Nucleic acid binder design. Structure first.
Lengths: 125, 50, 40, 52, 135, 124, 211
RNA sequence: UUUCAAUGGCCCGUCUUGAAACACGGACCAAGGAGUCUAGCAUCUAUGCGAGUGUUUGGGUGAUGAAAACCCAUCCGCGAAGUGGGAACGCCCUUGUGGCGUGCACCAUC
RNA sequence: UUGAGAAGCUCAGACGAGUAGGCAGGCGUGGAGGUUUGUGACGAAGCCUUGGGCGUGAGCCUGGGUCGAACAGCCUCUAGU
């Protein structure tokens, strides 16, 4: 149960906040779990996704697939993973969007900003 | 009452004096597979009941 | 060793015996009275 | 006992409150009806559902 | 609201009607028939009777109240105006808290209508009383 | 014991066959100048308490049993003692996973099921 | 002998407390009436909680056999307090516990006659019954106590002769055995009681002197 | 269910009128569409307490929603200000029959 | 003899038009508290049907088809019923 009068349990206001969120909020809304190896080595459970991240698809028809994240589609809350495509009528390959919570991060595109993020969120390297 | 447990019928009885101890409220005995003996078992255990 | 025939049962059986005695006596004289009545 | 009191003693935590009393002392009507005091003076019961 | 069952939803009042339904038909007493009829009556038709009226009615004229139980199907309220309460035995549906304390501390006893049915199942040696309906 | 039905035709609302806007469900005619209310000759019948069926055979199916709606196995076990008076009727919203387990349970209990072959096939 | 232990929720504790109370009742000291009244509140609830018919037959036997254990001086008070607590709690029992308490009263009815016979070995029988008839008259058979239930007295009338014959299987000596009933039938303000007690009672005037 | 045969069967609502005649409303279907809320008063019933009764203007309090529940200081409102018949009961005793008493509520008589 | 939802069970007789109006018991709808250790992607609700059944009736249960994510029975509360 929530006891703060500063947070709303209203489904109307929760749905409006999620679907009307700005880009700097959808960066956090699009978070993915880390693999057990990374999770117990970086001391971090989940991180927001990013391009060049290496992920494994965990749920859906494409379950078990792996690949880098070519681009994150924050408008529709979708990830676009390389070689995870669908053939069209004319044979052109249309990429398939995957929710960020349906993948797991097996390798992190480490940067100084993310390295600072790890030590910030109780992590280590 | 009589109820069945995994193929064996049991006679369940409760008394007024165990009414406030739910774990020990109902007592249970085994009823023989022999029908005549099962009827007599109910008669002996329920003696002077209505 | 044995159950002692509850005392409510004993009280009822004594009461039922009194009523059963009355019923037989009432019907015993009713049959004689009815037979004489039918002849009348 | 202090929150509710007793049917004769006032509650400590409720000023001037006594537990409600009952219209019947013993609420087992079967015990009163089938008692020795009452069954000894009732007239002989007629039958149950009677023959046609 | 008065004919064949009380309009009351009180479960314990239904248990008294059940008890005197048995007593009315299994005994040839008009007391059990009268008590049963007054249990179906409404609150307006069952006026309270003061503790002073019971004391006055029992010790009236020749008095000689002996120990007859006073029976009222109603509430026995208190009369603070009277100062000395006699030794009385009253059976009623309800006693007020002051009336019950005054009756008990001043000698006698208070009974319910089911406690009296076990003492006088035919209502023998009972003083059946009523409250004035003038109001 | 045979079930006698005083009437088998339903009581239709008056003038329900002339208009689509007026449903078949019975409505008491409130018109004073209505021939149906005054019960002339040739006018339709009306629901009267005289048409009420025998109390003993009321709610009884033509096979002599009374319907008992069943939503799971626990409901059908209640009819252990009343299998000669009641028939199990599985509800319409009970899935085929539970319909099969109700039918198998009702078979050992000796209980008739009114719709036992619904949403399933057989495999001998 | 703690009363709180006599009314415990487990039967093992109640049996242990009953055994400890066996010694407590045999002391050579005078217990006041209130002390026995409180003691009989626990003992009533020790009997009130007995579960199976075989246990409550033995439990009522244990309570009845407790009477000769009590000191002779305050033995009458033990019985007189038993019939006081069985009169004020009789109407509060339910219909499923009356049969277990009927037997206890019956066992104590015979416990009075058996104690009468024991004291008759040394002292004369006339004064022993007089002491007991005083207990019966001041207690259950009191005419000024309108609240004492007739169910107890109807039971006592039903078993008075049949439990006296048990104590004296060979012959019953002359005594005022039926004195409490004679006083009650004559001068009781309960018309139901005096109109039905002679029917229930089966007093045998074979030995008592003709009036 | 459709259809046939035999027998029967004037269009519904409103108003009118003994009655109808009437005059009105009705192309069809869907959805919407009319004794509601509140203040006061009186009867009745139920419930609580009862010569009392009413916590919620307010204060206290309430960590798990704290607009709830729980508690009540001072006021105040409204209330308070003999003879007959007879319910019921006991006692009889020719026992039923009736009589002898005790007499509620209420109605008649002072 | 088991027939004590004593609010049950049971026996008997008479009776049955009905406007205004009086009275009683029921059917259905939206939402609320409780409950069914309730139903549901192995198909909820809805709709369709010369399928079947129950009730004097309001109505209710169900098969088949269609359909695609919620919903109901019981006690009580409530009303833009």
């Amino acid at each position: 149960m929530k006891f703060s009068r500063d947070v709303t349990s209203s489904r109307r206001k929760q749905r409006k906040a999620h679907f009307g969120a700005p880009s700097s909020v959808r960066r956090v809304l699009m978070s993915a779990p880390l693999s057990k190896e990374l999770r117990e080595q970086y001391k971090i459970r989940s991180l927001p996704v990013r391009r060049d991240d290496q992920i494994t698809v965990i749920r859906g028809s494409n379950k078990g697939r792996e690949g880098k994240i070519t681009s994150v589609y924050r408008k529709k809350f979708l990830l676009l993973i390389e070689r995870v495509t669908r053939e069209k009528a004319n044979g052109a390959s249309a990429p398939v969007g995957i929710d960020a919570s349906k993948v797991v991060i097996t390798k992190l595109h480490l940067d100084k900003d993310r390295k600072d993020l790890i030590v910030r969120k109780g992590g280590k390297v | 009452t009589v109820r069945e447990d995994n193929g064996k019928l049991y006679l369940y009885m409760k008394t007024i004096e165990r009414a406030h101890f739910p774990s020990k409220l109902w007592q249970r005995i085994k009823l023989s597979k022999n029908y005549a003996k099962a009827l007599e078992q109910i008669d002996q255990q329920l003696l002077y009941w209505p | 060793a044995s159950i002692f025939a509850p005392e409510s049962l004993l009280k009822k059986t004594k009461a039922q015996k009194q009523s059963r005695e009355q019923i037989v006596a009432a019907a015993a004289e009713k049959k004689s009275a009815r037979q004489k009545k039918r002849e009348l | 006992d202090s929150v509710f009191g007793s049917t004769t003693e006032v509650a400590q935590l409720k000023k001037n409150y006594f537990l409600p009393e009952n219209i019947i002392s013993n609420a087992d009507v079967t015990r009163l009806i089938n008692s020795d005091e009452i069954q000894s003076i009732v007239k002989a019961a007629g039958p149950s559902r009677v023959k046609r | 609201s008065q004919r064949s069952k009380p309009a009351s939803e009180n479960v314990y009042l239904k248990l008294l009607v059940k008890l005197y339904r048995f007593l009315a038909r299994r005994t040839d007493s008009r007391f059990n028939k009268a008590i049963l009829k007054r249990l179906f009556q409404s609150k307006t038709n069952r006026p309270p009777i003061s503790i002073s009226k019971i004391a006055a009615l029992t010790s009236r004229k020749s008095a000689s109240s002996q120990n007859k139980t006073t029976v009222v199907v109603g509430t026995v309220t208190d009369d603070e105006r009277m100062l000395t309460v006699p030794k009385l035995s009253i059976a009623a549906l309800r006693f007020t808290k002051s009336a019950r304390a005054r009756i008990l501390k001043a000698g006698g006893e208070v009974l319910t209508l089911d406690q009296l049915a076990l003492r006088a199942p035919t209502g023998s040696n009972t003083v059946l009383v009523r409250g004035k309906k003038h109001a | 014991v045979n079930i006698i039905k005083k009437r088998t035709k339903p009581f239709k609302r008056h003038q329900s066959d002339r208009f689509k806007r007026v449903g078949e469900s019975w409505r008491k005619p409130r018109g004073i100048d209505s021939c149906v209310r005054r019960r002339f000759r040739g006018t339709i019948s009306m629901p009267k308490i005289g048409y009420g069926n025998n109390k003993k055979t009321r709610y009884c199916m033509p096979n002599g049993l009374k319907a008992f709606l069943v939503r799971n196995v626990s409901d059908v076990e209640l009819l252990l003692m009343h299998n000669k008076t009641y028939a199990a009727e599985i509800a319409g919203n009970v899935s085929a996973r539970k319909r099969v387990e109700i039918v198998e349970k009702a078979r050992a209990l000796g209980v008739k099921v009114t719709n036992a072959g619904a949403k399933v096939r057989s495999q001998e | 002998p703690f009363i709180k232990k006599l009314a415990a929720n487990d039967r093992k504790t109640r049996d242990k407390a009953l055994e400890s109370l066996q010694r407590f009742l045999s002391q050579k000291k005078k217990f006041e009436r209130l002390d026995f009244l409180k003691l009989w509140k626990g003992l009533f609830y020790c009997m009130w909680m007995a579960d199976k018919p075989l246990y409550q037959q033995k439990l009522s036997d244990n309570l009845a056999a407790l009477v000769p254990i009590v000191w002779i001086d305050n033995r009458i008070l033990f019985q007189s307090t038993f019939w006081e607590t069985m009169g004020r709690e009789w109407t509060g029992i339910d219909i499923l516990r009356t049969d277990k308490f009927y037997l206890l009263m019956r066992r104590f009815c015979a416990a009075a006659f058996r104690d009468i016979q024991t004291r008759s070995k040394t002292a004369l029988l006339d004064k022993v019954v007089a002491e007991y008839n005083q207990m019966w008259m001041d207690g259950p058979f009191n005419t000024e106590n309108l609240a004492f239930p007739n169910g107890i007295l109807f039971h006592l009338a039903d078993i008075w002769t049949e439990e006296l014959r048990k104590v004296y299987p060979e012959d019953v000596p002359k005594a005022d055995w039926y004195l409490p009933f004679d006083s009650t039938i004559k001068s009781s303000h309960n018309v139901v009681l005096r109109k039905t007690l002679p029917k229930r009672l089966d007093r045998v005037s074979e030995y008592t002197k003709d009036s």
